[PDB]
C-alpha cells in the first residue's frame, strides 16, 4: 500500500507541480502526463517505471553510479527472499543431513549440531529480505532519478 | 454419498469442497483408484494412449484446416521472404474499429494473427504448394484421428482386451518399434522426399494423380539393384538453383553435400533424403536383435545378468534389474521422459543452427519462438523424469529383489552424491555471481579494463576442431594438412567448412568472455536443479528427520511442527521446489539465446560482446531497451498490432504475482477467514434461503503449492512469450 | 595471437580506451583551481589511470576487439606463452590460503572435542589455542598429506550415522 | 478418518494422551514396559490430525504415529 | 546379569534411531524381561530435544 | 460408575451471547453439550470468545464441535479444579455420552479398557509399500 | 578483567575484530598496490 502512495506522490509532483519556470510558463519534469496516462496499468509501467528508471540504469561511470549498483543489489535481495518464503525447513533439514555427513567423513563436524531455521524464522527471514530488497529498489530509483533531473 | 468421483469412496464421502478439487486431481492416478488391479491398470493406460494420439492428430488437422481456410499460404509461397504468414482469422465482437484496422494485414479480408510456429516453412519444404494440398491433409488427419479413437474403444471390449503378459513382452515390442515404428517410418519418409518433396523443389508437380508415371531418377532402380548406388548422387542442385523452380536444379536424389542451400539457407533436400535412408537401414537392422517366437536373438534378462564386473566394484551388477524395470511403470516412464526430455533439447539446439526448413532462418520471430518453445517443454519433461523416478522408489522399489545391485548401491552412497552436487552448485554460484558483481562494480566506477574476462579457450578449441579458422588453432578440420581434413574433402567438408566459416549464420557462432560467464550460469542451473530433484528421489523413502517417509506416500503435506518442523518434507515438495529452478535455468538459456541473436540479426554483435559481461548490461541493453515497442502497443494516443502482446505482457505479470499469494500466505489464515463468511451467509436475510451443498473450506496445504506453482509458471511463460514475439517481430517483422 | 586476440600494447582499441577515461577526468578538472583540493584529487586519479594502462600493457595481456584484457585459463596455453600469472599461478595461491583456513579450523575443532564441554568452546573461542593453531597452519599441505597416507584423515564408514535405506 | 497406531516402543509416559485435544487416546494396562501401561487409540473417528500426540512422544523413533486419511466433518474440524 | 554394564559405552544399531552408529552411555538395564530394557544417554540431542532412549539387548553393542 | 443421563433443563452460565456460537450444523447434523458442578460463582473464558460467569451448582453449555467442549474441559479442570463431562446430541433427540468414556479420565490407566490400534512392532519393522499394492484401496504399510 | 576478556572472546566480538583486521589488510594492500589484475 505504501509503495503505491510514494509512486502516486512521485509521479504527481513531477507531472503537475515540479518544473522550471520560464517566460512562456511552467514546464514540468514529466510534462503533465499524469492526467492522461495514470488511468491504466500500462501507463504506470511505461510512463512511470520504464521511463523514469532511465536515470538509474545509465548511472554507471558517474557520481550516481552507486545508485545503479544498489538498484541491482536490491533486486537481488528481494528475489533471494522468495527462497525462504516459498520453501519449508523440512527440505533444508534433510539437505543439511547430507552436508553434515561429508563433514563427519572428514572429522570436521561441528559440536553445535547444525539445524535448519525454525518455521517462524524462515518467515521472518523471508519478509525482512523481501522488504529490504523492495524498499531499497525504490530508494535507489527515486534518488538517482530526482537528483539527476530534479 | 455423492457420485463424483466414482473411482474413490474416500473422496465421495467428503462433505467439503475438497471433494471437487481432489476428484479432478486424482483422476489419472489409476494406481490409487478403488478396486484397481494390475491387469486393469495396463488396459486403462493403453486406452488412454489412443486418446492422446487422437488429440494429437486432431490438433494437427485443425492447424492445416485454418491455414488453408484463412491463411495466405498460396501467396506466401510466391514471395516467402517479404510476406508474413497468417495463423488464423479473428472474430472478436469486443474489438473497436481501430483494432479491426490494426490487425488487418497481409492482404487478408479482415483481422488475422501472424503465425510464429513455422508450419509454413515446414509444409512448403516438404512439397505443399496449394491450399487444396493442405485441405486433403487436414481431412486425412481428421480421419486418422477417428481411427485411433475407435481403436481405443475396440481394445477395451471383452474379446480385444490384451492380457497382463502382453504388456510385458519386452523383446517383441522393441523389435517392432525399432524396425517398424522407427525404421519403416523413416524408410517411408525417404520415399516421400525422393518421390514428392525433391521434385517439387525443382518445379515439377508430383501428386497422387501422377506419381506412378513420374520417374524420381532418370535411371529407374537400375543403379539400386546393380549396386551402382553412386549414380544417385550425380548432378546435384547447383548453387544457383532457385527453390521451387527448375532453373539451376539437378538430378541427384541422394547426396552428402553437407552445407546449406545458398538461397533458402537450409539443409539440402538430397542430404535429408540420404539421412533418413541411412538411419532406416540401421534401425531396421537394429530391430532384429531380441528374442521372439523364431528361436534367434537376445533375451534382455540374459544381457543384464551377464554384465557384472568381476572385481565386485558394482556389487551384484545388473542382476534383478529386468524385473525392476519390467514391473514398474514409473521406472519406465522416468526413462521415457528423461530420454525424450533430452532429445527435445537436442531438437532446439540443432534446429536453430542447422535450419532444415526453407526460409526459416530469415523468419527471426519463428526461430526465436521455436527455440524457446522446445527448451521450456524440455525443462518440464526433465522435472517429470525425476518426479516419476522418485515415485518409483516409494511405490515400486523392492529392496529384497534388488539386493546389492547398482540401483540398491545408489541409495548406499546417497549422502556422497548429494554432498558433491551441493559443492558444485555452491562453487558455481559463488564464482559465477562474484565475477558478474566484480564486472558490475568496475563498470560503475568507470574502469571497464579492470574486469575479469576469461576467454572460452576450451570451447573455442572445439570450434577449431570443426573448421572454424577465426581462432587460429589450426587443429584437425582447421588445418589443411590433417588426415581428417583430407579424407572428408570430397564428401561433405567443402559445404560444411563453407557454412561454419560464414559468420552471418548461427552455425557455431563466435564466442567470447560474455559466453563464458553465461555458460557457467547455465551449469549452475543444471546442477542445482539436479540437486533438488536427486535429493527428492534418494530421500523419498526416508531420512533421519523422517525415517519412515515411505509409509506416507509420494505427496503429503508435512509431519507436523514436531521435531523442529517438517514443512515441505515429502518427495512431492522436492519436485515443487525444483520447478522454480528449472524455470530459472531455462530463462537464462532463452535470454542468452535471444540476446545473442538479436545483436546478430541487427549486425551489431559488438553490443553483446561488450555489454554481456556485467549484469547491468542485461537489464539495460536487453530487457529495458527491447521493451520500448512492446509497452507502446496501446497508449493514450492509439494502438497498433502489438497491443495484443502489450496486453498479454501485463496479463502475464498479473498471473505471476497472483501465484505469490498461494506461495507466501498459507492455509491457516484463509480457513479462519472463510469461517466468518460462512457465519455471514447464514445470518443474512434473503440470502440464507439459498445454501451450499459442499461445505466451503480453504485449499489444502498441498493444493495451494500446486496452485501457486501453476500461476507462477503460467505468468512466467506468458510474460516472456509476449516479450519474445513482440521484441523480435516488431524489430524486423 | 591466441584465439585471435592481440597484445594490449599493440591494440588500437586499447589505446583509444585510455584517452576516453583521461578525457573524462580532464573535463571535470577544468572547473576547479590549479592546486585546490578537488584538483589535486583528480590529478591523482589521472596518474593512477595512466599507470594502470601501462602496467597491463607491460604485463603482456591479450586484448580482444573490445580492447579489454582477456585472461588465459588453460595451463598449457598459459605456460606456453607466458600467461601463467593470470589464472594458473593465482590458482595455487588461493588454494594455499583456502587450505590454510580450512586446516586451521579443523585442527581447532578436533582440539576442543576432547574438552569436557566442546559446545562452550565454540561460541566462546579459546584465543590462546586458536593463535597457536593459526601459526602452525603454514605447513598444512605437508601435514594434510601425511594424515592422508596414515589413514587418519577420514572417519570409518561404521562410525558415521546414516538414514534407513 | 485418520489412522493412529501405537507401537511396542511405548514407555507409558501418558504424554500423548494429555496432549490430544480431542480425547482420541487413552492408557490401558500392559506388561511390555516398566510403567505396565500402553497408549491406545479407541476413538480415531474423532481424530483431526493435529499430531500433538507425536510432538509429545519421548521415544525415538515415535511410538505413536498418525497417518492422515479420508476427510469428514469431524476430521476436518468443522463447526458448520 | 543381563546387558552391558552401567556407565559403559555402547554403539546403537537401530536404523530408525537418531543415534544409529553412534556411541552412548548406558544408564541402566532393566532385569524384568521388558522388550527394551537398556537405557542409553547421549551427549547430542535429537530433533525433538531428547537425549535418552531405550534399546533392546540386540540393538546395542559395546564400543568397537 | 454408571453412564450419566443428560438433564436438558440444567441452568446455563450468565453469558450475554456472541457471534461465535452454534450454526445451522447444530440443527441438521449434531452438537455437543458440556455439564459440570461449580463450587462458587466465577468468571471463565468461553472458547467461542468472551467471558461468562458460572452459576453455583450445575452448569450447562452447548458447543458446535467436540474440540470446543474439550477445550473448556481443560480450562475448568486445570485452573478451577472442576470435573466436567460432555455429550454428543443429535437432532433426532438421541444423546451420546463421552469423556469420560468409562468415568475415569483417559490420562489415568484403568482396568477393563481394551487396547485398540496397537501394533506389536516398531515403526521400522513395517513392510514396504510395494507389498501392500493393489489391495483395493490406498493402504499404508502400517495398516496391515 | 578475566570475565571482560572472556566477553571479548565471544564469537561476535572475535568475528568483528578478525574481519576488521582482515578487511584492513586487504584495503591497505590495495592502497599501496592499486589495481592488481595479474600476478606478474
Ligand atoms: C473482455 C476481454 C476480452 C474477451 C472476453 C475476448 C474474447 C475473445 N477474443 Mg479477444 N482480445 C481482447 C479482449 C477480449 N477478448 C483484447 C484486449 C485483445 C488485444 C487487442 C484481444 C485480442 C484478441 C485476439 C488477437 C483474438 C481474440 C480472440 C477472442 C475470441 C476467442 C474465442 C474462443 O476461442 O473462445 C473459446 C476460448 C478459449 C479456447 C480460451 C479459453 C481456454 C480455457 C479457459 C482453458 C481451460 C480449459 C479447461 C478444460 C476448462 C474448461 C471449462 C468448460 C466449462 C468449458 C473471443 C471472442 C481470438 C478470436 O478471434 O478467435 C476466433 C483471437 O484470435 N482476442
Ligand atoms: C510395426 C509394428 C508397430 C508399430 C508401427 C507400433 C506403433 C506404436 N505403438 Mg506399438 N507395439 C507393437 C508393434 C508396433 N507398434 C507390438 C508388436 C506390441 C506388442 C509387444 C506393441 C505394444 C504397444 C503398446 C503397449 C503401446 C504401443 C504404442 C505404440 C504407439 C507409440 C506412440 C507413437 O505414436 O509414437 C510415435 C513415435 C515416433 C514416430 C518416433 C519418435 C522418436 C523420433 C526419433 C522423434 C523424432 C523424429 C522426427 C525428427 C520428428 C519429426 C517431427 C515433425 C514435426 C517434423 C505407436 C503408434 C503405445 C500407444 O500409444 O498405443 C496406443 C502403447 O501404449 N505399442
Ligand atoms: C517405402 C517407401 C517407398 C515406396 C512405397 C516406393 C514406391 C515406389 N517407388 Mg520408390 N523409392 C524409395 C522408397 C519408396 N518407393 C526410396 C527410399 C528411394 C531411394 C533409394 C526410392 C527410389 C525410387 C526410384 C529411383 C524409383 C522408385 C520407384 C517406385 C515405384 C515402383 C516400384 C516398383 O515397381 O518396385 C518393384 C520392386 C520389387 C517388386 C521388389 C522390391 C524389393 C524391395 C527390397 C522392397 C521390400 C519390401 C519392403 C521392406 C517393404 C517396406 C514397407 C512397405 C509398407 C512399403 C513405386 C511407386 C520407381 C518408379 O517408376 O517410380 C514411379 C523408380 O523408378 N523409387
Ligand atoms: C507422459 C508423461 C506423463 C504421464 C503419463 C504422467 C502420469 C502421471 N503423473 Mg506425471 N509428470 C509428467 C508427465 C507424466 N506424468 C511431467 C512432464 C511432469 C513434470 C511437470 C510430471 C510431474 C508429476 C507429478 C509431480 C505427479 C505426477 C503424477 C502423475 C500421476 C497422476 C496425474 C494426475 O492425476 O494428474 C491430474 C491433473 C491435474 C490436477 C491438472 C494438471 C494440469 C496442471 C495443473 C497445469 C494446468 C495449466 C493450465 C492448463 C494453464 C491454463 C492457462 C490459462 C491462461 C488458460 C500419473 C500416473 C502424480 C502422482 O500421483 O504421482 C504418483 C504426481 O504427484 N506427475
Ligand atoms: C535470487 C534468488 C536466489 C538465490 C541467490 C539463491 C541461492 C541459492 N539457492 Mg535458492 N531458491 C530461490 C532463489 C534463490 N536462491 C527460489 C526462488 C527458490 C524456490 C523456493 C529456491 C529454492 C532453492 C533450493 C531448493 C535450493 C536452493 C539452493 C540455492 C543455492 C545454490 C548454490 C549457489 O548458488 O551457491 C552460492 C550461493 C549464493 C549465490 C547465495 C548468495 C551469496 C551472497 C551473495 C553472499 C554475500 C555475502 C557478503 C559478505 C554480504 C553479507 C551481508 C550480510 C551479513 C548483511 C544458493 C544458496 C540449493 C542449495 O542450498 O544448495 C546448497 C538448494 O538446494 N534454492
Ligand atoms: C580442463 C580440461 C582441459 C582442456 C579441455 C584442455 C585443452 C587443451 N589443452 Mg590443456 N591442460 C589441462 C586441462 C585442459 N586442457 C590441465 C589440467 C593441464 C595440466 C595442468 C593441462 C596441460 C596442458 C598442456 C601441457 C598442453 C595443453 C594443451 C591443450 C590444448 C591441446 C591439447 C589438449 O589438451 O587437448 C584436449 C585436452 C584433454 C583431452 C585433457 C588433457 C590434456 C593434457 C593434460 C595435455 C595434452 C597436451 C598435448 C599432448 C600436446 C600435444 C601438442 C599439441 C600442439 C597438439 C587444448 C587447448 C596443449 C597446448 O598448449 O596446445 C596448444 C599443451 O601443450 N594442456
Ligand atoms: C569471484 C569473486 C571475485 C574475484 C575472483 C575477484 C578478484 C579480484 N578483484 Mg573483485 N570483487 C568481487 C569479487 C571478486 N573479485 C566482488 C563481489 C566485488 C564487490 C564488493 C568486487 C569488487 C572489487 C573491487 C572494487 C576491486 C576488485 C579487485 C579485484 C582484484 C583484487 C586483487 C588483490 O586484492 O590482490 C591483492 C594481493 C593479494 C596476494 C591478496 C591476498 C593476500 C594474502 C595474505 C596472500 C597470501 C599468499 C600465500 C582481483 C582481480 C581490485 C582490482 O583492481 O581488480 C582488477 C579492485 O579494485 N574487486
Ligand atoms: C568510563 C567507564 C568504563 C567502564 C567501567 C566498568 C567498571 C566495572 O564494572 O568494572 C568491572 C571490572 C573490574 O571490577 C570488578 O568488579 C567486580 C564487581 O562484582 C568485582 O568486584 C571484581 O573483583 C572487580 O575486579 O572491570 C574490569 O575488570 C575492566 C573492564 C574493562 C576496562 C577497560 C575498557 C573500558 C574503558
Ligand atoms: C604409463 C602407462 C599407464 C597405463 C595405465 C593403464 C590403466 C588401465 C586401467 C585400469 C583401471 C582399473 O583398475 O580398472 C578396474 C575397474 C574395472 O573393473 P572390473 O571388475 O571389470 O575389472 C577388474 C580388473 O582389474 C581385472 O579384470 O575399472 C575401474 O575402476 C576404472 C576403469 C576405467 C576405464 C577407462 C577406459 C579407457 C578410457 C581412456 C583412457 C586413456 C587410454 C589409455 C588407458 C586405458
Ligand atoms: C532418479 C531416478 C530415475 C531417473 C533418472 C533420470 C531422470 C536420469 C537422467 C539422466 C540423463 C538425462 C542423462 C544423460 C546422459 C547423457 C550422456 C551420458 C551423453 C553422452 C554423450 C556422448 C558420449 C557423446 C559423444 C560424442 C560427442 C561429445 C561428440 C562427437 C560424437 C560423440 C557421440 C562421439 C529413474 C527413472 C532411473 C528411476 C530411479 C531413480
Ligand atoms: C535457505 C533456507 C534455509 C537454510 C538456511 C540456513 C541454515 C541459514 C544459514 C545462515 C548462515 C549462512 C550459516 C551460519 C554461519 C556461521 C555464523 C559461521 C559464519 C563464519 C564466517 C564466514 C562469518 C532454512 O533453514 C529455511 C528454513 C525455513 C524456511 C526456508 C529456509 C530456507 O530457504
Ligand atoms: S506413545 Fe509415546 S507419549 Fe504415548 S504413552 Fe507411549 S511413549 Fe508415552
Which strand (E) or helix (H) includes residue C104?
A: helix C88-113
Length of chain F equals 144
Q: Find out whether B351 is annotated in a ligand binding site.
A: no
Whole-angstrom distance, CA of residue F84 vs CA of residue B113:
74
| Mutation for testing the B interface, residue in E20, E47, E49 having most B CBs under 10 Å | E47
Ligand 2 geometric centre to CA of A20 (Å): 73
User: Solving technique for this entry?
Assistant: cryo-EM
Q: Which helix (H) or strand (E) holds B704?
A: helix B701-731
Pick left, alpha or beta for residue E14 (phi over 0 → left; psi -120 to 50 → alpha; otherwise beta).
beta
HSE (CB half, 13 Å, CA atoms) of B447? 19
E strand or H helix that includes residue B616: helix B615-617
Measured between alpha carbons, how far is B697 from B571 in angstroms, rounded to an integer?
26
B661 annotated to a ligand binding site: yes
Cβ-contact B86, B72 below 8 angstroms: yes
Alpha helices of B185-268 — where are they, by DSSP H? 185-192, 198-201, 222-225
Q: Which of E46, E32, E26, E50 is closest to E59 using CA atoms?
A: E26
- Residue B699 gets the label, from left (phi > 0), alpha (psi -120 to 50) or beta, of beta
Under 8 Å between Cβ of C100 and C138: yes
Domain B2-732, CATH: 1.20.1130.10
The rounded distance, in Å, linking the Cα atoms of A48 and B617 is 21
Q: What is the DSSP letter of B476?
A: G
Of D22, E30, G37, whose CA–CA distance to C63 is shortest? G37
Which three cell numbers mark B170? 519386452
Please indicate whether residue D25, judged by its CB atom, sits closer than 6 Å to ligand 12.
Answer: no
**Is residue E14 less than 8 Å (CB to CB) from chain F?**
yes
- Residue of chain B with shortest Cα separation from E50: B563
User: Which H or E element spans position C103?
Assistant: helix C88-113
Q: Specify which residues F95 forms β-bridges with.
A: F89
CA atoms within 13 A on the CB side of B281: 5
User: How many domains does chain D divide into?
Assistant: 1
CA of residue B386 to ligand 12 center, whole Å:
38
- Would you call B541 helix, strand, or coil by DSSP? coil
Would you list the DSSP string of B653-677? HHHHHHHHHHHHS-HHHHHHHHHHH
Best of A111, A112, A113, A115 to disrupt the C interface (most C CBs within 10 Å) is: A111
Closest Cβ–Cβ partner in D54, D78, D79 for B560: D54
CATH 3.30.1470.10 fits F1-143, yes or no: yes
The C-alpha cell 544409529 sits at E20
CB contact under 8 A, G35 and C55: yes
- Tell me the C-alpha distance between B194 and B251, whole Å: 11
Say whether F23 and B678 touch across the interface (CB within 8 A): yes
Residue B39, burial from CB neighbour count under 10 angstroms (0-12, 13-18, 19+):
middle
Residues 6+ apart with CB under 8 A from B679: D80, F19, F23
For C145, counting Cβ atoms within 10 Å of its Cβ (0-12 exposed, 13-18 middle, 19+ buried), the class is exposed
Rounded Cα distance between F68 and F54, Å, is 17
Please provide the distance, in angstroms rounded to a whole number, between the alpha carbons at the two ends of chain A: 25
Contact call for residues B383 and B531 (beta carbons, < 8 A): no
Domain boundaries, chain F: 1-143
- C-alpha to C-alpha distance for B103 and B98, rounded to whole angstroms: 9
Report how far apart, in Å, the C-alpha atoms of B474 and of each of B470, B487, D15, F125 are: 9, 17, 78, 66
- Asked if F123 and E16 touch (Cβ cutoff 8 Å), the reply is yes
Q: After which residues is chain C broken (C to N over 2.5 A)?
A: none
Q: Which residue's alpha carbon is at the smallest distance from atom 5 of ligand 12? A: D12
Interface of B with C (CB under 8 A): 399, 411-412, 414-415, 446-455, 457-458, 460, 470-473, 512-513, 539, 541-544, 547-548, 606, 609-610
Quick one: cell of B137? 491433409
Q: Which cell numbers in the block locate residue B114?
A: 501472424
Cβ-contact B450, B553 below 8 angstroms: no
Q: Which of B482, B511, B518, B512 is nearest to B497 (CA)?
A: B482
- Cβ of D66 below 6 Å from ligand 12: no
Q: Give the CA count within 13 Å in the CB-facing half-sphere of B359.
A: 22
Question: How far, in Å, are A106, A129, F42 from residue F52 at the CA level?
Answer: 64, 44, 8
How many Cβ pairs within 8 Å bridge chains D and F?
Answer: 108
The SS3 assignment for B486 reads helix
Outline where DSSP puts E strands in B63-124.
86-89, 112-114
In angstroms, the CA G6 to CA G4 distance is 5
Q: Nearest Cα to B181, choosing from B289, B283, B298, B46?
A: B283
Residue nearest ligand 10's atom 11 by CA = B338
Which CATH number does the domain housing residue D63 bear? 3.30.70.20
- Using a CB–CB cutoff of 8 Å, tell me whether E28 touches chain C: no
C-alpha B337 to ligand 10 mean position (Å): 12
Q: For ligand 12, what atom is nearest to the CA of residue D25?
A: 4
Q: Which residues line ligand 10 (CB under 6 A)?
A: B 331, 334-335, 338, 342, 385-386, 389, 392, 537
Do G and E make contact via 3 or more CB pairs under 8 A? The reply is no
Amino acid at each position: 500500500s505504501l509503495s503505491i502512495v510514494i509512486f502516486h506522490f512521485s509521479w504527481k509532483m513531477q507531472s503537475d507541480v515540479w518544473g522550471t519556470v520560464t517566460a512562456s510558463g511552467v514546464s514540468h519534469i514529466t510534462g503533465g502526463n499524469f492526467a492522461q496516462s495514470a488511468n491504466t496499468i500500462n501507463g504506470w509501467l511505461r510512463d512511470f517505471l520504464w521511463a523514469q528508471s532511465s536515470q538509474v540504469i545509465q548511472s554507471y561511470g558517474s557520481a550516481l553510479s552507486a545508485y545503479g549498483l544498489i538498484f541491482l543489489g536490491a533486486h537481488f535481495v528481494w528475489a533471494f527472499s522468495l527462497m525462504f518464503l516459498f520453501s519449508g525447513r523440512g527440505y533444508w533439514q534433510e539437505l543439511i543431513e547430507s552436508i553434515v555427513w561429508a563433514h563427519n567423513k572428514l572429522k570436521v563436524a561441528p559440536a553445535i549440531q547444525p539445524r535448519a531455521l525454525s518455521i517462524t524464522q524462515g518467515r521472518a527471514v523471508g519478509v525482512a529480505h523481501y522488504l529490504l530488497g523492495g524498499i531499497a529498489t525504490t530508494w535507489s530509483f527515486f534518488l538517482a532519478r530526482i537528483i539527476s533531473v530534479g | 454419498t455423492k457420485l463424483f468421483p466414482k473411482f474413490s469412496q474416500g473422496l465421495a464421502q467428503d462433505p467439503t469442497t475438497r471433494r471437487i478439487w481432489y476428484g479432478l486431481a486424482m483422476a489419472h492416478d489409476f494406481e490409487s483408484h478403488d478396486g484397481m488391479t494390475e491387469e486393469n491398470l495396463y488396459q486403462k493406460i493403453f486406452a488412454s494412449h489412443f486418446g492422446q494420439l487422437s488429440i494429437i492428430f486432431l490438433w494437427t488437422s485443425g492447424n492445416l484446416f485454418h491455414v488453408a481456410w484463412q491463411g495466405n499460404f498460396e501467396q506466401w509461397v510466391t514471395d516467402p521472404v517479404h510476406i508474413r504468414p497468417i495463423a488464423h482469422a479473428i472474430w472478436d465482437p469486443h474489438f473497436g474499429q481501430p483494432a479491426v484496422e490494426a490487425f488487418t494485414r497481409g492482404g487478408a479480408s479482415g483481422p488475422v494473427n501472424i503465425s510464429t510456429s513455422g508450419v509454413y516453412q515446414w509444409w512448403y519444404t516438404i512439397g505443399m504448394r496449394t491450399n487444396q494440398d493442405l485441405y486433403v491433409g487436414s481431412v486425412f488427419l481428421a480421419l486418422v484421428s477417428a481411427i485411433f479413437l475407435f481403436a481405443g474403444w475396440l481394445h477395451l471390449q471383452p474379446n480385444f482386451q490384451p492380457s497382463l503378459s502382453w504388456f510385458k513382452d519386452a523383446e517383441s515390442r522393441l523389435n517392432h518399434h525399432l524396425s517398424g515404428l522407427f525404421g519403416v517410418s523413416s524408410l517411408a519418409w525417404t520415399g516421400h522426399l525422393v518421390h514428392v518433396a525433391i521434385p517439387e523443389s525443382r518445379g515439377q508437380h508430383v501428386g497422387w494423380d501422377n506419381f506412378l508415371s513420374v520417374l524420381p531418377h532418370p535411371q529407374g532402380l537400375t543403379p539400386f539393384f546393380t549396386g551402382n548406388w553412386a549414380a544417385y548422387a550425380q548432378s546435384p542442385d547447383t548453387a544457383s538453383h532457385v527453390f521451387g523452380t527448375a532453373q539451376g536444379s539437378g538430378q541427384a536424389i541422394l547426396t552428402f553435400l553437407g552445407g546449406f542451400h545458398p538461397q533458402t539457407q537450409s539443409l539440402w533436400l538430397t542430404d535429408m533424403a540420404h539421412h533418413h535412408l541411412a538411419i532406416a537401414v540401421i534401425f531396421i537392422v537394429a530391430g532384429h536383435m531380441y528374442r521372439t517366437n523364431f528361436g534367434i536373438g537376445h533375451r534382455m534378462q540374459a544381457i543384464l545378468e551377464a554384465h557384472t564386473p568381476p572385481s565386485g566394484s558394482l556389487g551384484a551388477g545388473h542382476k534383478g534389474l529386468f524385473d525392476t524395470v519390467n514391473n514398474s511403470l514409473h521406472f519406465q516412464l522416468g526413462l521415457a521422459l528423461a530420454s525424450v526430455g533430452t532429445i527435445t533439447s537436442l531438437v532446439a539446439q540443432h534446429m536453430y543452427s542447422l535450419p532444415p526448413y526453407a526460409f526459416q532462418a530469415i523468419d527471426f520471430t519463428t526461430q526465436a519462438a521455436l527455440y524457446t518453445h522446445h527448451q521450456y517443454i524440455a525443462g518440464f519433461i526433465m522435472c517429470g523424469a525425476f518426479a516419476h523416478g522418485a515415485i518409483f522408489f516409494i511405490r515400486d522399489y523392492d529392496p529384497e529383489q534388488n539386493k546389492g545391485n547398482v540401483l540398491a548401491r545408489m541409495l548406499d552412497h546417497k549422502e556422497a552424491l548429494i554432498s558433491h552436487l551441493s559443492w558444485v552448485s555452491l562453487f558455481l554460484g559463488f564464482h559465477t555471481l562474484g565475477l558478474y558483481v566484480h564486472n558490475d562494480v568496475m563498470q560503475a566506477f568507470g574502469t571497464p579494463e579492470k574486469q575479469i574476462l576469461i576467454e572460452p579457450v576450451f570451447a573455442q578449441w572445439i570450434q577449431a576442431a570443426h573448421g572454424k579458422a577465426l581462432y587460429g588453432f589450426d587443429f584437425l578440420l582447421s588445418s589443411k594438412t590433417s588426415a581428417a581434413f583430407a579424407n572428408g574433402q570430397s564428401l561433405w567438408l567443402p559445404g560444411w567448412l563453407d557454412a561454419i566459416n560464414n559468420n552471418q549464420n548461427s552455425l557455431f557462432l563466435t564466442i567470447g568472455p560474455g559466453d563464458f560467464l553465461v555458460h557457467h550460469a547455465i551449469a549452475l542451473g543444471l546442477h542445482t536443479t539436479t540437486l533438488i530433484l536427486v535429493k527428492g528421489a534418494l530421500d523419498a523413502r526416508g531420512s533421519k528427520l523422517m525415517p519412515d517417509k515411505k509409509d506416507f506416500g509420494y505427496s503429503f503435506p508435512c509431519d507436523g511442527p514436531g521435531r523442529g518442523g517438517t514443512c515441505d518434507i515429502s518427495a512431492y515438495d522436492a519436485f515443487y521446489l525444483a520447478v522454480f529452478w528449472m524455470l530459472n535455468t531455462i530463462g537464462w538459456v532463452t535470454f542468452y539465446w535471444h540476446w545473442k541473436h538479436l545483436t546478430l540479426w541487427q549486425g551489431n554483435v559488438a553490443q553483446f560482446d561488450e555489454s554481456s559481461t556485467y549484469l547491468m548490461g542485461w537489464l539495460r541493453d536487453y530487457l529495458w531497451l527491447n521493451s520500448s515497442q512492446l509497452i507502446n502497443g496501446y497508449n493514450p494516443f492509439g494502438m497498433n498490432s502489438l497491443s495484443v502482446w502489450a496486453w498479454t505482457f501485463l496479463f502475464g505479470h498479473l498471473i505471476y504475482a497472483t501465484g505469490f499469494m498461494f506461495l507466501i500466505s498459507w492455509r491457516g489464515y484463509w480457513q479462519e477467514l472463510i469461517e466468518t463468511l460462512v457465519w455471514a451467509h447464514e445470518k443474512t436475510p434473503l440470502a440464507n434461503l439459498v445454501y451450499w451443498k459442499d461445505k466451503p473450506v480453504a485449499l489444502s496445504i498441498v493444493q495451494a503449492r500446486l496452485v501457486g506453482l501453476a500461476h507462477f509458471s503460467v505468468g512466467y511463460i506468458f510474460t516472456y512469450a509476449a516479450f519474445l514475439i513482440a521484441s523480435t517481430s516488431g524489430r524486423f517483422g | 595471437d591466441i584465439a585471435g586476440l592481440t597484445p594490449c600494447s599493440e591494440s588500437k582499441a586499447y589505446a583509444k580506451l585510455e584517452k576516453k577515461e583521461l578525457k573524462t577526468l580532464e573535463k571535470r578538472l577544468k572547473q576547479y583551481e590549479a592546486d585546490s583540493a578537488p584538483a589535486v584529487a583528480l590529478k591523482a586519479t589521472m596518474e593512477r589511470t595512466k599507470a594502470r594502462f601501462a602496467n597491463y600493457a607491460k604485463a603482456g595481456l591479450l586484448c580482444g576487439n573490445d580492447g579489454l584484457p582477456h585472461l588465459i585459463a588453460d595451463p598449457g596455453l598459459a605456460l606456453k606463452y607466458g600467461h601463467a600469472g593470470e589464472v594458473f599461478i593465482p590458482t595455487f595461491g588461493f588454494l594455499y590460503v583456502a587450505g590454510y583456513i580450512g586446516y586451521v579450523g579443523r585442527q581447532y575443532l578436533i582440539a576442543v572435542k576432547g574438552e569436557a564441554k566442546p559446545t562452550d568452546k565454540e561460541i566462546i573461542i579459546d584465543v590462546p589455542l586458536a593463535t597457536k593453531l593459526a601459526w602452525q597452519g603454514a605447513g598444512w599441505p605437508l601435514a594434510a598429506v601425511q594424515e592422508l597416507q596414515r589413514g587418519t584423515l577420514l572417519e570409518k564408514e561404521e562410525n558415521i550415522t546414516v538414514s534407513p535405506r | 478418518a485418520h489412522i493412529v497406531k501405537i507401537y511396542d516402543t511405548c514407555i507409558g509416559c501418558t504424554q500423548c494422551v494429555r496432549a490430544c485435544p480431542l480425547d482420541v487416546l487413552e492408557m490401558v494396562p500392559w506388561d511390555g514396559c516398566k510403567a505396565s501401561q500402553m497408549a491406545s487409540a479407541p476413538r480415531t473417528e474423532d481424530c483431526v490430525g493435529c499430531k500433538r500426540c507425536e510432538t509429545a512422544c519421548p521415544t525415538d523413533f515415535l511410538s505413536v504415529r498418525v497417518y492422515l486419511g479420508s476427510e469428514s466433518t469431524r476430521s476436518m474440524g468443522l463447526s458448520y | 546379569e543381563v546387558g552391558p554394564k552401567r556407565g559403559s559405552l555402547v554403539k546403537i544399531l537401530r536404523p530408525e534411531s537418531y543415534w544409529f552408529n553412534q556411541v552412548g552411555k548406558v544408564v541402566s538395564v532393566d532385569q524384568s524381561g521388558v522388550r527394551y530394557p537398556v537405557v542409553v544417554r547421549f551427549e547430542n540431542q535429537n530433533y525433538a530435544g531428547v537425549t535418552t532412549n531405550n534399546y533392546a539387548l540386540d540393538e546395542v553393542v559395546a564400543a568397537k | 460408575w454408571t453412564v450419566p443421563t443428560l438433564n436438558p433443563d440444567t441452568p446455563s452460565p450468565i453469558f450475554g451471547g456472541s457471534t461465535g456460537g452454534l450454526l445451522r450444523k447444530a440443527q441438521t447434523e449434531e452438537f455437543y453439550v458440556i455439564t459440570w458442578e461449580a463450587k462458587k460463582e466465577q468468571i471463565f473464558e468461553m472458547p467461542t470468545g468472551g467471558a461468562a460467569i458460572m452459576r453455583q451448582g450445575p452448569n450447562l453449555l452447548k458447543f458446535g464441535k467436540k474440540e470446543q467442549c474439550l477445550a473448556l474441559t481443560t480450562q475448568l479442570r486445570n485452573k478451577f479444579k472442576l470435573t466436567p463431562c460432555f455429550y454428543r446430541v443429535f437432532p433426532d433427540g438421541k444423546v451420546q455420552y463421552l469423556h469420560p468414556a468409562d468415568g475415569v479420565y483417559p490420562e489415568k490407566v484403568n482396568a477393563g479398557r481394551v487396547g485398540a490400534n496397537q501394533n506389536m512392532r516398531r515403526i521400522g519393522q513395517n513392510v514396504n509399500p510395494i507389498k501392500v499394492k493393489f489391495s483395493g484401496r490406498m493402504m499404508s504399510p502400517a495398516e496391515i | 578483567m578475566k570475565d571482560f576478556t572472556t566477553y571479548l572472546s565471544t564469537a561476535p566480538v572475535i568475528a568483528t575484530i578478525w574481519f576488521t583486521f582482515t578487511a584492513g589488510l586487504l584495503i591497505e594492500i590495495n592502497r599501496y598496490f592499486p589495481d592488481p589484475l595479474v600476478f606478474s
